[PDB]
């Protein structure tokens, strides 16, 4: 009676970096809801592109120590704060972001000079605290990859400190199945529950996961253009002893073993 | 002052330090076992039976550890004390099998 | 479910020294039985030794079962089932591997 | 250089060259002393006036059981300085995270407290202030206040940084080890990763335990390690 | 109880984790 | 069952020969028929192994089942520490 339709039943935004969304898909035949929920969860967790800082270059700072003057936070803690920055972007490849700031004050995500296609989800995120009137320039490395992907190149070693950034824009995902019976009408209802870090709304993550899943199974529909006698043994057939020993050394006992390896043939072909 | 001060081995004691394959007991420090009772300075019940007894435990039990340890010995990944892996080495293999 | 603990034939890990201890007990039992036939010991002395030498061996195997599991195969499926207290105890495992 | 102003007070009573396990009849003014609180004892060191409480006067020192008035004389085991110095005070101990019994409702599930067994007083290089842009810790002069023995000594520090006494202090890295007894100075570029430090100590401990476990096997002498 | 035991059965330590004597990721949350 | 109390077996922790003064202990016959020594003092036995000596202390009123200069394998019972139904045995 009904058609397969989806709807958002719950939608909460109790943060600038924590969005919640619950979605319903119905009616579904028996066994389909589990398949959709499993695949969608995999797409949401790793197949969705995420943008975050991967490397940090401390320009004009030859200290190379764990701490620098004028900044309360240690160098390692600054990288930790950078790793928490939530970014949304459509960039292809890699870009460069710069943080050149004044003396005393608070360095926040609002102070990051951004490449054209990227945005700061929450500009209030704290990077570092400045005490002494000293300028600080930071060379960021903005990259956009999937959660499941892995990268090995790390700019070798040129005083650029790598940031082990996790590329998940969907913090968590879960699916639930509700089955309703009417005597013989077994329909299933699929609930999709998505948590995002604000880089994309849960409704958007639902569409991207669906599109990424479809793009995976499109190639299976691709087409390409067109252009215009174990029971007989070598013992029985009369063979020279020289040839017989050579075959026996190579575990060629039957004739099938002989044809599987490639005046021997002249005598053999007649029988 | 007087509290401030301003400033490796080889073979054994270096393989042992680094964990590289080495005997458990240093061969240069292995004391030869002294002569013991010769079945005539000893009571009965401690003498050798003068004729080896069938035991049904005379063969070492086949193990996954022994086969892998022998396979690793010929590869050079491991260096056993002898041709056959001892029960100590097989037990050690289980701890570090992964 | 995810870890999927599961026991196999070789998961029932036996103490490495069981072969030695059983063989040693057999030698003492065989030597004593031979002298019992000679008349150097009486029936009760043979009876006590047979019971006690095999009980002490069994208890020692049970005693050494946990330290062997801990030191060699800490994640042994049979060990984790009993050591964690989920199912079974040392005595029941001893019936399987001792 | 940079000697601190050697001022003199009126209540100054020098305790140098006194018996250790004996108490003093009089009572000291705690405002004039640094109060060092440890697990087994409370340690007092004369505090000359200063804009920041960094100047220590080791001429008179007192040790008392924690939160008690009966002062004593610490067991001095080193030639403590006779001049005012600036020492960075950093404690050394363990966290005693315990699970107390629960009888009253809403009783805490855990009780986390820090127990101090030793306190390190690292002299500032040339007695330079913390706010000084050229501040750096002189790791040569470190004093250890042990709670268990209620004694104060000087750290036996081994300097492995190439450069001798003329080296650059900014590259120093004090490595305290063995229950606060072995002090070693190494170059900062040679710092060990904290993961390496933990794994190194665990590898040494387990290796010795494994050998003892395998020692009882009768083919141990004819077995290899790997 | 088995599942919880496996969860809390932490890292391999010492000689069970490294082949040789030494002589890891950081997560912000 | 037969020792009438708690019995602990001191096993050899290392291979090697056992050195002790047999005069310090009293000869006896065990309940199994094996000759042995009864120890009434804090006797210390020496196991000279491949690497080093491995002195072991034997508490009093404990049977010493081995002999001087005897070679003992590891995990082999050396001494028994000794710190009433009547059954008819037909033969």
CA atoms within 13 A of residue A160's CA, in its CB half-sphere:
18
Distance CA D28, CA A164 (A): 55
Closest CA to A52 of A101, A148, A119, A127: A119
Closest CA to A79 of B39, B11, E26: E26
* Contact (CB, 8 A) for D3 and D83: yes
- Across the interface, of E12, E16, E21, the residue whose CB is closest to B18 is E21
CA distance readout (Å), A38 to A173, A195, B5: 10, 16, 65
Distance CA B22, CA B5 (A): 35
For residue F76, give both structure tokens: 């082999």
Distance CA B28, CA B11 (A): 11
In the block, residue with structure tokens 């319903």: A24
Mutation for A interface: E25, E26, E29, most A CBs within 10 A: E26
Contacts of A176 (CB under 8 A, 6+ apart): A37, A190, A191, A193
Q: How many residues in total does chain C contain?
A: 98
For residue C75, give both structure tokens: 């994640």
Straight-line distance from the first to the last Cα atom of chain E, in angstroms, rounded to the nearest whole number? 27
Closest CA to F11 of F82, F81, F83, F74: F74
Q: Which residues, listed in sequence order, are joined to residue D121 by a DSSP beta bridge?
A: D89, D143
Distance CA D172, CA D139 (A): 8
Question: Could you say which DSSP state residue A71 is in?
Answer: B
Among residues 56-95 of chain B, which lie with CB inside 8 Å of chain F? none
**Residue D213 preceded by cis peptide, ω within 30:** no
Distance from CA of E12 to the nearest CA of D (A): 10
Q: What Å resolution does this PDB entry report?
A: 3.0
Distance CA A113, CA A53 (A): 13
Distance CA D116, CA D95 (A): 9
Phi, psi of C15 (to 5 degrees): -60, 135
Distance CA E5, CA C90 (A): 17
In the block, residue with structure tokens 């959660």: A147
H or E element in which residue A145 lies: strand A136-145
> β-pairing, A19-28 with A5-12?
antiparallel
Q: Which runs of consecutive H residues, i.e. helices, occur in chain D?
A: 194-215
* Contact (CB, 8 A) for A40 and A210: yes
Q: What is the DSSP string of D28-48?
A: --GGGEEEEE-SS-EEEEE--
* Contact (CB, 8 A) for D186 and D160: yes
Question: Could you say which DSSP state residue A30 is in?
Answer: T
For residue A125, give both structure tokens: 């995120």
Closest CA to D84 of D108, D56, D62: D56
> How many other CB atoms sit within 10 Å of the CB of residue D204?
16
Tell me whether residues F75 and D216 touch, CB distance under 8 A. yes
For residue C32, give both structure tokens: 């004593």
Q: Which runs of consecutive H residues, i.e. helices, occur in A72-131?
A: 75-83
Tell me whether residues B61 and C28 touch, CB distance under 8 A. no
Partners of F49 on chain D (C-beta within 8 Å) are: 221
Residue of A nearest to D171 (CA): A65
For residue F28, give both structure tokens: 């006896």
* Three-class DSSP category at C24: helix
Q: Which residues, listed in sequence order, are joined to residue F9 by a DSSP beta bridge?
A: F80
Partners of D209 on chain C (C-beta within 8 Å) are: 71
For residue D30, give both structure tokens: 């705690």
* Three-class DSSP category at A43: helix
For A232-265, give one letter per residue: b (16+ CB within 10 A) or e: eebeeeebeeeeeeebeeeebeebeeeeeeeeee
Distance CA B51, CA B48 (A): 8
Using left for φ > 0, alpha for ψ between -120 and 50, and beta otherwise, residue A208 falls in alpha
* Three-class DSSP category at A268: helix
Residue of E nearest to C2 (CA): E3
Tell me whether residues C71 and D210 touch, CB distance under 8 A. yes
- Across the interface, of F15, F48, F67, the residue whose CB is closest to B34 is F48
Distance CA D68, CA D26 (A): 13
Phi, psi of C69 (to 5 degrees): -65, -45
Phi, psi of B13 (to 5 degrees): 75, -5
Closest CA to B69 of B18, B27, B21, B12: B21
Straight-line distance from the first to the last Cα atom of chain F, in angstroms, rounded to the nearest whole number? 21
* Contact (CB, 8 A) for D34 and D53: yes
- How determined? cryo-EM
- Across the interface, of E16, E20, E21, the residue whose CB is closest to B95 is E16
Closest CA to A143 of A79, A49, A37: A49
Closest CA to A111 of A98, A121, A130: A98
Rounded to 10°, the helix D194-215/B87-95 angle is: 150
For residue A94, give both structure tokens: 């890699």
CA distance readout (Å), D131 to A131, D2, D4: 12, 15, 15
Distance CA B60, CA D139 (A): 60
Distance CA D14, CA D24 (A): 12
Phi, psi of F36 (to 5 degrees): -160, -175
> How many other CB atoms sit within 10 Å of the CB of residue D43?
22
* Contact (CB, 8 A) for A189 and A26: yes
* Three-class DSSP category at A18: coil
Mapped to the 3 state alphabet, what secondary structure does D65-81 carry? CCCCCCCECCEECCCCC
> How many other CB atoms sit within 10 Å of the CB of residue D35?
11
Tell me whether residues D209 and C20 touch, CB distance under 8 A. no
> How many other CB atoms sit within 10 Å of the CB of residue B19?
19
H or E element in which residue A108 lies: strand A105-108
Phi, psi of A15 (to 5 degrees): 180, 175
Q: What is the DSSP string of D184-203?
A: EEEEGGGPPPHHHHHHHHHH
For residue F36, give both structure tokens: 């042995």
CA distance readout (Å), F40 to D219, F10, F30, F58, F64: 34, 16, 15, 9, 10
**B and A touching (3 or more beta-carbon pairs closer than 8 Å):** no
Using DSSP, how many helices (H) and how many strands (E) does chain A show? 6, 12
> β-pairing, D42-46 with D33-37?
antiparallel
CA atoms within 13 A of residue D166's CA, in its CB half-sphere:
1
Distance CA D145, CA D91 (A): 9
């Amino acid at each position: 009676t009904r058609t397969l339709q989806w709807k958002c039943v719950e939608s909460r935004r109790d943060s600038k970096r924590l969005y919640y969304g619950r979605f319903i898909l119905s009616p579904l035949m028996k066994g389909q809801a589990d398949t959709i929920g499993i695949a969608m969860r995999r797409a949401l967790l790793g197949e969705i592109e995420g943008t975050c800082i991967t490397r940090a270059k401390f320009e004009n700072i030859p200290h190379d120590y764990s701490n620098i003057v004028g900044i309360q936070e240690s160098v390692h803690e600054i990288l930790m704060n950078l790793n928490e920055i939530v970014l949304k972007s459509n960039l292809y490849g890699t870009r460069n972001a710069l943080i050149c700031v004044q003396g005393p004050g608070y360095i926040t995500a609002r102070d990051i000079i951004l490449p054209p296609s990227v945005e700061i989800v929450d500009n209030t995120q704290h990077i570092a605290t400045l005490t002494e009137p000293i300028n600080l320039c930071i060379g960021l490395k903005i990259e956009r990859n999937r959660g499941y992907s892995l990268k090995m190149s790390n700019n070798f070693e040129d005083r650029s400190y790598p940031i082990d950034a996790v590329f998940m824009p969907v913090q968590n995902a879960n699916h639930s199945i509700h089955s309703y019976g009417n005597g013989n009408e077994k329909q299933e209802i699929l609930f999709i529950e998505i948590w995002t870090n604000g880089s994309l709304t849960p409704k958007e993550a639902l569409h991207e996961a669906s599109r990424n899943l479809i793009n995976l199974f499109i190639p299976f529909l691709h087409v390409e253009e067109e252009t215009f006698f174990q029971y007989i043994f070598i013992d029985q057939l009369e063979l020279p002893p020289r040839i017989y020993n050579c075959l026996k050394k190579s575990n060629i006992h039957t004739l099938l073993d002989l044809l599987n390896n490639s005046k021997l043939l002249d005598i053999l072909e007649k029988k | 002052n007087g509290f401030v001060v301003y400033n490796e081995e080889t073979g054994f004691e270096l393989d042992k330090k680094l964990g590289r394959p080495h005997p458990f007991i240093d061969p240069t420090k292995k004391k030869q076992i002294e002569t013991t009772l010769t079945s005539d300075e000893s009571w009965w019940n401690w003498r050798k039976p003068e004729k080896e007894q069938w035991s049904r435990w005379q063969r070492r039990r086949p193990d996954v550890e022994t086969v892998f340890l022998k396979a690793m010995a010929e590869t050079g990944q491991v260096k056993l004390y002898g041709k056959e892996p001892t029960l100590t080495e097989t037990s050690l293999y289980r701890a570090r099998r992964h | 479910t995810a870890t999927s603990i599961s026991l196999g034939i070789d998961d029932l890990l036996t103490i490495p020294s069981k072969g030695w201890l059983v063989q040693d007990a057999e030698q003492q039992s065989l030597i004593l039985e031979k002298h019992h036939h000679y008349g150097n010991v009486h029936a009760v002395e043979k009876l006590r030794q047979s019971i006690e030498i095999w009980y002490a061996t069994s208890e020692y195997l049970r005693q050494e079962m946990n330290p062997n599991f801990r030191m060699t195969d800490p994640f042994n499926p049979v060990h984790m089932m009993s050591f964690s207290g989920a199912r079974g105890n040392a005595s029941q495992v001893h019936q399987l591997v001792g | 250089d940079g000697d601190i102003a050697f001022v003199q007070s009126k209540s100054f009573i020098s305790t140098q060259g006194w018996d250790s396990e004996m108490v003093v009849d009089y009572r000291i003014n705690e405002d004039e002393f640094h109060k060092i609180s440890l697990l087994d004892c409370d340690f007092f060191i004369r505090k000359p006036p200063d804009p920041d409480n960094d100047v220590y006067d080791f001429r008179e020192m007192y040790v008392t059981p924690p939160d008690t008035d009966i002062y004593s004389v610490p067991r001095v085991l080193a030639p403590m300085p006779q001049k005012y110095i600036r020492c960075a005070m950093s404690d050394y101990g363990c966290y005693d995270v315990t699970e107390p019994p629960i009888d009253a409702p809403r009783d805490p599930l855990y009780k986390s407290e820090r127990e101090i067994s030793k306190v390190f007083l690292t002299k500032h290089y040339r007695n330079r202030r913390l706010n000084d842009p050229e501040f750096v810790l002189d790791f040569e002069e470190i004093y250890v206040i042990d709670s268990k023995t209620k004694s104060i000594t000087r750290a036996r520090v081994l300097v492995t940084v190439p450069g001798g006494r003329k080296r650059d202090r900014k590259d120093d890295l004090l490595v305290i080890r063995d229950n606060g007894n072995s002090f070693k100075i190494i170059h900062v570029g040679e710092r060990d990763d904290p993961t390496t430090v933990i794994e190194r100590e665990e590898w040494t401990k387990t290796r010795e335990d494994m050998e003892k476990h395998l020692r009882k096997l009768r083919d141990f002498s004819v077995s290899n390690w790997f | 109880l088995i599942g919880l035991y496996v969860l809390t059965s932490g890292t391999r330590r010492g000689i069970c984790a490294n082949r040789y004597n030494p002589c890891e990721p950081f997560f912000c949350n | 069952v037969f020792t009438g109390g708690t019995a602990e077996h001191v096993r050899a922790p290392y291979n090697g020969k056992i050195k002790f003064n047999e005069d310090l202990v009293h000869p006896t016959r065990t309940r199994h028929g094996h000759p042995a020594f009864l120890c009434y003092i804090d006797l210390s036995v020496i196991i000279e192994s491949e690497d080093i000596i491995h002195s072991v202390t034997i508490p009093p009123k404990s049977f010493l089942l081995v002999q001087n200069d005897q070679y003992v394998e590891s995990e082999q019972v050396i001494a028994e520490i000794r710190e009433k139904e009547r059954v008819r045995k037909y033969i």
